[PDB]
Amino acid sequence: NRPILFDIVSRGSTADLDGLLPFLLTHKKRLTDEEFREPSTGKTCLPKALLNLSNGRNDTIPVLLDIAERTGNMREFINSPFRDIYYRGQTALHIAIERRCKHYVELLVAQGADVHAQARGRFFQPKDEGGYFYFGELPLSLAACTNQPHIVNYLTENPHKKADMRRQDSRGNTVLHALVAIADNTRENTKFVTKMYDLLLLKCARLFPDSNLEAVLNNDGLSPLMMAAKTGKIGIFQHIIRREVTDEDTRHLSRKFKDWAYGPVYSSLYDLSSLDTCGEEASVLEILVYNSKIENRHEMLAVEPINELLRDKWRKFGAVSFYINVVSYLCAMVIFTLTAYYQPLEGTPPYPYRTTVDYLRLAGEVITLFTGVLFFFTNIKDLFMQLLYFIYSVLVIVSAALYLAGIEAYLAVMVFALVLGWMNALYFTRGLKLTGTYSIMIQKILFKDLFRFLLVYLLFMIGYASALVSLLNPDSETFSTFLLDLFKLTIGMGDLEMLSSTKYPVVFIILLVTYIILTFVLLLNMLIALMGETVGQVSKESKHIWKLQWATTILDIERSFPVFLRKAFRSGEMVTVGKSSDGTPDRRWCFRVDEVNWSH
Amino acid sequence: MVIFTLTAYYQPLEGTPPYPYRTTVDYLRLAGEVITLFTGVLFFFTNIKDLFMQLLYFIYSVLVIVSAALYLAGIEAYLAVMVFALVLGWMNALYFTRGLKLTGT
Amino acid sequence: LEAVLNNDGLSPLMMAAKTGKIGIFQHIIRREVTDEDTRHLSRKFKDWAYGPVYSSLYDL
Numbered sequence: 001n002r003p004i005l006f007d008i009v010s011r012g013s014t015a016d017l018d019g020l021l022p023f024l025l026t027h028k029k030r031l032t033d034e035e036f037r038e039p040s041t042g043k044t045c046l047p048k049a050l051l052n053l054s055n056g057r058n059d060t061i062p063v064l065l066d067i068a069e070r071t072g073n074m075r076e077f078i079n080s081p082f083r084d085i086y087y088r089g090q091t092a093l094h095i096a097i098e099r100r101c102k103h104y105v106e107l108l109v110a111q112g113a114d115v116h117a118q119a120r121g122r123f124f125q126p127k128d129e130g131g132y133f134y135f136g137e138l139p140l141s142l143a144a145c146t147n148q149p150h151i152v153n154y155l156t157e158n159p160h161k162k163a164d165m166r167r168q169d170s171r172g173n174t175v176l177h178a179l180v181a182i183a184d185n186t187r188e189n190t191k192f193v194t195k196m197y198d199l200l201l202l203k204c205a206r207l208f209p210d211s212n213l214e215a216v217l218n219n220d221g222l223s224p225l226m227m228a229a230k231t232g233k234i235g236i237f238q239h240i241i242r243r244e245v246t247d248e249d250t251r252h253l254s255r256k257f258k259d260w261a262y263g264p265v266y267s268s269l270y271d272l273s274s275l276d277t278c279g280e281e282a283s284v285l286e287i288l289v290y291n292s293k294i295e296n297r298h299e300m301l302a303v304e305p306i307n308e309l310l311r312d313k314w315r316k317f318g319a320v321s322f323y324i325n326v327v328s329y330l331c332a333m334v335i336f337t338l339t340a341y342y343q344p345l346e347g348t349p350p351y352p353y354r355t356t357v358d359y360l361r362l363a364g365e366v367i368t369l370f371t372g373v374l375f376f377f378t379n380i381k382d383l384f385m386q387l388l389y390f391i392y393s394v395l396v397i398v399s400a401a402l403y404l405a406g407i408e409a410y411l412a413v414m415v416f417a418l419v420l421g422w423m424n425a426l427y428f429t430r431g432l433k434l435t436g437t438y439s440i441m442i443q444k445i446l447f448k449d450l451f452r453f454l455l456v457y458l459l460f461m462i463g464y465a466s467a468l469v470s471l472l473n474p475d476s477e478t479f480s481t482f483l484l485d486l487f488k489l490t491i492g493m494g495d496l497e498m499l500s501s502t503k504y505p506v507v508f509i510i511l512l513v514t515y516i517i518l519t520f521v522l523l524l525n526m527l528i529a530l531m532g533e534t535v536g537q538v539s540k541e542s543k544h545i546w547k548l549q550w551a552t553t554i555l556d557i558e559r560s561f562p563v564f565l566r567k568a569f570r571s572g573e574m575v576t577v578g579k580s581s582d583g584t585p586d587r588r589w590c591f592r593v594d595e596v597n598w599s600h
Numbered sequence: 601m602v603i604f605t606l607t608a609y610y611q612p613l614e615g616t617p618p619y620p621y622r623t624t625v626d627y628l629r630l631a632g633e634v635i636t637l638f639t640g641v642l643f644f645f646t647n648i649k650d651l652f653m654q655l656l657y658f659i660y661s662v663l664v665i666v667s668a669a670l671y672l673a674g675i676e677a678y679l680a681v682m683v684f685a686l687v688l689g690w691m692n693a694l695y696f697t698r699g700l701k702l703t704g705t
Numbered sequence: 706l707e708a709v710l711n712n713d714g715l716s717p718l719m720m721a722a723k724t725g726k727i728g729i730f731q732h733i734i735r736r737e738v739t740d741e742d743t744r745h746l747s748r749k750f751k752d753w754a755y756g757p758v759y760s761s762l763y764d765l
């Protein structure tokens with residue numbers, strides 16, 4: 001009778017249902033029997049009826065509910081979930097809410113519909129995880145994510161059942177987490193996202209004054225603000241960072257207060273407790289600056305307190321430590337250079353020391369080894385809990401070890417270390433503004449475009465030179481010699497005296513001509529062109545890249561210091577902005593900004 | 601192309617073309633030669649079918665086949681054109697980066 | 706009607722593509738007919754919708 005029932009419900013006709021009650025009573029067959037349910041998914045009668053209706057009025061639902069109550073299977077029938085990978089978990093209430101039918105939502109909850117049921121089927125998953133619509137996996141989160149204020153209002157405060165706002169799905173995300181998860185930078189989306197977020201926050205605070213809704217964290221460990229920063233959602237991040245609440249009852253949770261005004265000058269202090277931390281917990285700034293592949297990484301930093309905080313930190317302690325570090329690094333490299341220079345050529349390593357000058361060389365050596373081990377330890381700690389610096393440190397330590405063992409080879413690698421030691425000194429110009437943007441651009445072009453160009457050139461050059469070598473007739477040694485000669489000719493110095501043994505010299509001349517033409521005219525020119533266009537495309541990006549580089553250097557310096565030193569240098573003044581519900585003072589960290597307005 | 605490069609490199613300078621084969625190394629060179637000729641004839645057939653029903657590849661194939669023919673006939677000149685083929689063989693390897701996005705533009 | 710081909714062997718869609726006419730090519734590639742009598746000749750149908758997600762299958 002399953003096909004007949006499905007046809008009856010799909011049609012929506014009331015008459016066909018007559019007689020089902022006595023039929024079930026006589027045969028004592030429940031509406032959740034395997035035969036009645038569709039084997040493919042598990043869909044029961046109610047979801048099918050709700051799926052296909054007219055102008056929000058199916059007109060069959062009450063009869064189905066009455067029948068199920070007659071049987072006495074409402075508990076297992078009204079909330080019967082779907083099976084299968086695609087739609088697992090989905091219940092009738094999810095459908096009713098998805099179809100924007102308040103009437104049916106009320107009628108469903110009135111009868112005992114499970115309001116906390118989770119719909120974690122593969123249809124409802126994040127876009128990156130092979131899904132279509134992620135909404136928090138809850139009826140309440142669904143209504144909040146589909147921009148339906150009335151549904152959320154009724155659902156939260158209903159006599160029969162209440163879905164508390166502070167509730168977490170399998171992933172741990174709460175309704176605010178989902179509402180940030182579906183946010184997009186479009187104006188239409190943000191306009192309702194912010195409104196619903198604020199409404200829901202105020203309602204939760206009103207109902208429960210003790211707890212805080214944004215305190216909750218998901219399994220990942222983030223909060224709505226940190227997650228919005230991580231997911232690159234400027235629209236809601238900017239509205240949460242400057243949230244101000246005029247209501248006196250709910251002013252405690254506000255984030256931006258007015259401090260004082262004199263004429264056109266207005267001075268307001270922002271709150272940055274969660275925004276900036278000293279190792280107590282993860283900070284928005286660290287996440288936004290250090291994580292990669294962020295949509296609006298550069299735009300997100302242009303917010304009223306963020307930029308001024310970076311500025312104040314830079315003045316307070318950023319500049320001094322940077323100059324100290326660069327000077328010390330240069331001095332250390334000079335000491336290393338002197339040590340390598342004065343390495344005694346005579347004898348074999350290690351060399352005995354029996355004079356004060358020997359002890360001077362030893363002092364330089366120990367300083368260099370200390371620097372190398374320090375860099376190695378810093379990199380290893382970073383890995384456990386700067387690739388070029390890692391190479392420098394590992395090469396230094398290996399050179400010291402081979403010096404201890406006894407072999408000439410160490411000097412080579414030791415010298416190589418010195419090369420790298422200066423090769424990256426340019427990267428310390430990063431902190432400087434005028435030359436730091438140029439250093440960042442040089443590093444960017446060097447790694448991305450120069451890797452491709454070099455890889456393109458290597459095989460071409462080696463194969464073409466091998467072809468020319470094969471052309472000549474009087475053979476690894478011959479190739480080894482000729483390759484040096486050919487590279488020297490590529491430099492523009494030398495002479496092609498080796499062609500005497502070759503037959504058909506004309507074609508060899510032509511081939512060398514074309515080789516030179518390609519190497520100098522086309523290959524070299526394209527490298528020139530690429531730099532010119534990239535800078536033009538990033539002409540505006542220059543300031544963005546510079547600001548990001550400045551931020552990352554400042555944050556690296558801040559991270560390096562231990563916790564208590566950070567406590568000493570922490571920026572912002574403790575300001576008692578009000579008294580909590582119990583009356584005790586807040587005493588919350590804040591940072592002050594003042595502007596000028598001639599229109600207010 | 602690597603196989604072709606090795607074949608050209610190990611072409612015996614001594615003697616005159618064709619060179620008799622009486623050793624396993626000779627058969628290694630012969631295997632490389634037949635592979636190169638197969639590649640050339642395949643490219644030639646593809647281009648000829650396109651024409652009946654890639655100009656640089658057409659040049660590569662025609663030069664390879666001509667070099668093989670002149671190797672069979674007996675003349676030193678073939679090596680020249682054979683080498684020239686190898687040049688073109690790599691000269692257009694860059695054009696296979698086309699498919700890649702970053703370097704294809 | 707679009708089955709007919711000229712001496713060249715093309716159809717209105719192929720000819721619009723060959724002649725570089727975006728305006729009519731885009732309107733012929735997404736042609737949808739609401740009338741039930743003449744829905745067979747339509748080229749873009751709606752498949753299903755869930756909330757803000759809409760899924761339509763084109764004919765190719």
Ligand SMILES: CC(C)CCC[C@@H](C)[C@H]1CC[C@H]2[C@@H]3CC=C4C[C@@H](OC(=O)CCC(=O)O)CC[C@]4(C)[C@H]3CC[C@]12C
Nearest residue numbers: 453454455456457458459461480481483484485487488
């Ligand atoms: C254009 C870019 C992408 C390719 C990099 C060029 C190198 C692959 C070339 C440039 C100079 C060449 C070298 C010139 C001299 C020698 C020594 C030679 O061995 C000898 O010592 C005998 C000759 C001599 O002693 O001068 C072996 C090859 C090598 C390293 C040559 C091999 C290839 C080198 C490093």
